[PDB]
Amino acid sequence: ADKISQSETYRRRRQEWEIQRNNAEAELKQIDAQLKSLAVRREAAVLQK
């Protein structure tokens, strides 16, 4: 039973690494669109110049 409980522990840990990896991927993905918005804001600032 202790071998089984160790196995279920390693599995739960791996699922928590899915929660963390997906959170990191989503934050990475949202940063690129933030950069796109800033690229626009800068094009409009060159145009104000």
Binding site: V40, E43, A44, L47
Partner: protein, 49 residues
């Protein structure tokens, strides 16, 4: 001579008027040219949103 002085005063009034009206037309053509860049800025602000 007094008739000539009267033509000279009319002539000065004409000169002042025509020069001011050429400035009036210059400021309108200049603001007509200034408006286009503001339109471009507003359009790129939409893309920012």
């Amino acid at each position: 001579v007094s008739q000539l002085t009267q033509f000279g005063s009319t002539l000065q009034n004409i000169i002042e008027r025509q020069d001011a009206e050429a400035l009036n037309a210059l400021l309108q053509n200049q603001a007509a040219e200034l408006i286009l860049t503001n339109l471009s800025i507003q359009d790129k602000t939409i893309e920012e949103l």
